[model samples]
Target: KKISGGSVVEMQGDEMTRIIWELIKEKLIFPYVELDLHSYDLGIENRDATNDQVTKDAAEAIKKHNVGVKCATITPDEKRVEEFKLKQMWKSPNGTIRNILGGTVFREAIICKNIPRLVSGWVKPIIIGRHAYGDQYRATDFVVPGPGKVEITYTPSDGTQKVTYLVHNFEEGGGVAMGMYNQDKSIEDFAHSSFQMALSKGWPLYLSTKNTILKKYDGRFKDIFQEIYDKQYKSQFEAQKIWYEHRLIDDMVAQAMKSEGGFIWACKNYDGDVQSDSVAQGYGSLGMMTSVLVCPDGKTVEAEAAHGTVTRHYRMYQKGQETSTNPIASIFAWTRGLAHRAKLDNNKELAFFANALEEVSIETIEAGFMTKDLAACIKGLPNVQRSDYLNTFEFMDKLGENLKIKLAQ
Candidate 1:
């Protein structure tokens, strides 16, 4: 019998991740779960050829279907543009998807007992929430040469009143200035998504911001989260024995470093970008990090690996050399995406299969079977040898074998 009972938007992407994406569905997913995939070729070349309408269409499909599993795609730079010889440097597909989807991204690191972590104390997973809209990411900045005055102006649409605030005065030398903002509507949506994620995990939630300094700026985020918690989630959280609180960014970082890992941390755009990397590295390998974009309504999701396309590994593979690229995060992308589908459909058997696949992947690694990336994490790069790890295909086969054994029982 088919394990899953739904359709999923399958977004194929670039480089080594694209290669692994195909292998995973072939060896692991298709053999087990019969799924109807609305496939979109999000490969860099395809995006360039279609003027990135493919990305927009894929995003629309995801919104319609409410579930998407994406492979890591190339967000080209100047060098990549020259290499691919493209029309223009296309924007990040993820950015396009997020724009169309309007969601908060939550990144979680997968844990395996035998796999060593830089922060050995993180026995549990640290789910990082990145409010991906407006802040530095969407800020307007310009260079001010010599002397200048910078100010922000707000005009009432109904001609009621005009407000102006002096931002800074560049009296002598050149300085840069920026105007950043966040809407109450966006913040409120971010709050809802964070609260939903925390409740889903049954873990305590903490919002980290420099509210003490950015009284009106970051304080708005803190205030909105607190208000939402009190008005909507407080009772449910209390019943679940979970809680929500706000923390100064610095103190929150220090606390996160010392704490035994098991909470949802909601961060501003810049903080999330910087800190998620810290958390990913602390856990060990980026290959162990899984990213899920949850919409404000908590009804739509797009899951993918936190890491980018493995270009170096793809180069080796192109030359017909064996590469031991890690596929854990990609595999989890499918599992988590399907798990979300299972939840939406209330398919218990499918959920069990998804959970089992995850457990078996971890079990395979804990049994000393993993890719070169994870082996490098365990043994230093200089100490790692070919014998210490499996090639990409070998690792997938191993996972498949183990998953079959698990399902049998």
Candidate 2:
């Protein structure tokens, strides 16, 4: 049957995920919905071939279309350089995409009833909205040879007086220095995106910063969020019985450890980079993490799995061994993107289909049907046996059967 879902910019990626990406669309997505996919190959070799222009083009397309679903790609290091015979180590495609999209990346763990979490208190998902644009990721660094003074200077383009602030004075030995900044515009965008995500989830929002130490630096984040919340979202949040608060980073981490997971925590670039991994491991597995990049306007989004290309599993598969790779997060990438499409198009059937697919994915695992990666999360690797999980393809087929049943109903 023909479906009326909206279009998506589909970015294909590398290694094992590249293999699973096609199967996911054929088995789970294409069989149900007739989607318009603007395909872009983001494979490492293809990227090198196009001088990474393919990645840039894909980002631009997503901007116009407002929806994207990407498979995991390789970010090469020196080892990968020799392995892939690449021209040069390309930067992360996600980073490139985020730069173009200019938004906050929110990652939510997909909770399954059967999956055991490391932090048992987390019965629900703790969505993390990262202000990913600036701070440490885009900093200028240098090494000092001996005793020297370091200072920061800011000059106004409108011919105002140049202001200088002393950073440090190295005395005894060689030291290091770095400088970072964030645009007020970028901070405002992050606030808007974080608020938008919290509003969508019907959950409270918290912005965490080390404002206590880096008064002017991190304090800017706290002030901007508070200003935005008071001016725009305070009443709306109260009406929904939700609220926004700022917490010191240390206190926020402690609170997160003890509390039941139900809110969205807005993090600075560095904190988000570190905490999201901790949160992922605490939830159970990266296989359950669903990542979405939402633009400040709340109209554009791109969804992808939080994990990387499963090279080890791919190697096993190449040797003709049956590998039980977890495709749950990859599957969610499509559903999450499609759900956004449904909202944009106001198509109830499409929405139902997306929700049903996500439901079946979780329900199937609860029914003792899952891949080995998730099986390891549940039973632990030492105790997990072949009977405890399905092979990679078998797991996908199982999800397909369950999805068909749900849709039939």
Candidate 3:
């Protein structure tokens, strides 16, 4: 059988997350998987040295390889600039990479048996597909006083056409709203991507929007999915025993809350930002959330751990204090990315290996070995010790031990 060969580019960063990133790679990755590793120190100083060219280069490399596992890096504020000393504040590396790559981010939480969810009923994970372009993230706005009107317009760069819309006056109080929508080209790509994810996972896909309220604005989303379904994806989804549908944003949330999980919920930018946190919290720990960017082409994907760099734990480590940090999510970043690689390559053995690693992770936790975050989540807890759960390095070793035995079997 054919096997896809790929590379893992390591983007280094600040503080606790930086500390955890190394342990994750050293223990979980280096000992188990053999592959080409490209290491780029994206720490604040290095970023400033290259004037952020390193980020662009790394993104381009991901485009070439089709998979990237990234560490959480700082998007420096004014304070960060002062503390780091001697450089202009840079934009988020993740944001920059997303723009260069042009894809939707789907965040899914890794469910563990001992984790206590805020929403107790959620058994399966809810994967949020966020359309990362246009909408609130990009808009033109101006403020008007007194009895003045505002007009917004779009002129085709091709010089083919021009369109304009007027802003109505507020009689009692003034407020702001903007005009935004995706083009047929972008919407079609989003549809295909959503459909591909659902079919690949054998999960149902639901596109949520406030279509009932913003008939024209959100209706376009509903209409596009419907059109795409009838024209292209409906049959393929049926063949895979999967389905697609549109639901009103409000109704969808309520349904999602009530039901047992196992579906992909596609959201516009704002909704995704809000709901992903909710999903992460409900799953019990940000340490278990894994994010993947799925491009419209369906050929490229980048996977990473969802939580930020562990600044607190790094401080403890700096003080020569032993800290138990979670490595599951970072480990899954590699496993998930490699599993997709296996699928693309038709190497079932590699796929099986990936699946076994994931199963071992869950089994380890269920058998009462877990990090502090997960320890707090475990119900009716007794005395759980550092020995019960492996330390940062030891736990990863435990996972590897489990993997070897499972694969041998």
Clashes of each: 0, 0, 3
- Model 2 residue 10 lDDT score: 97
lDDT of each: 0.91, 0.91, 0.79
Model 1, CA-based lDDT: 0.91
Model 3 misplaced stretches (Cα beyond 4 Å) = 1-5, 154-164, 170-179, 379-390
- Candidate 1 at 177: error in angstroms? 1.4
TM per candidate comes to 0.97, 0.97, 0.91
Worst 10 residues of 3 by lDDT: 1-10
- Model 2 misplaced stretches (Cα beyond 4 Å): none
Residue 165 displacement (Å), model 3: 4.0
lDDT, residue 402, model 3: 76
lDDT of 1 by residue, 158-274 (tens): 978799989888888988899888899999999999999999888999999997888988888988998989999999999999999999999999999998899999999999999
List the pairs of residues colliding in candidate 3: 16-310, 17-309, 17-310
How do these models rank on lDDT, best leading? 1, 2, 3
Q: List the residue pairs that clash in candidate 2.
A: none
Q: Write the per-residue lDDT of candidate 3 for residues 337-396, one digit (tens) a residue.
A: 888877777767668767877898899888877877777676434655555555665676
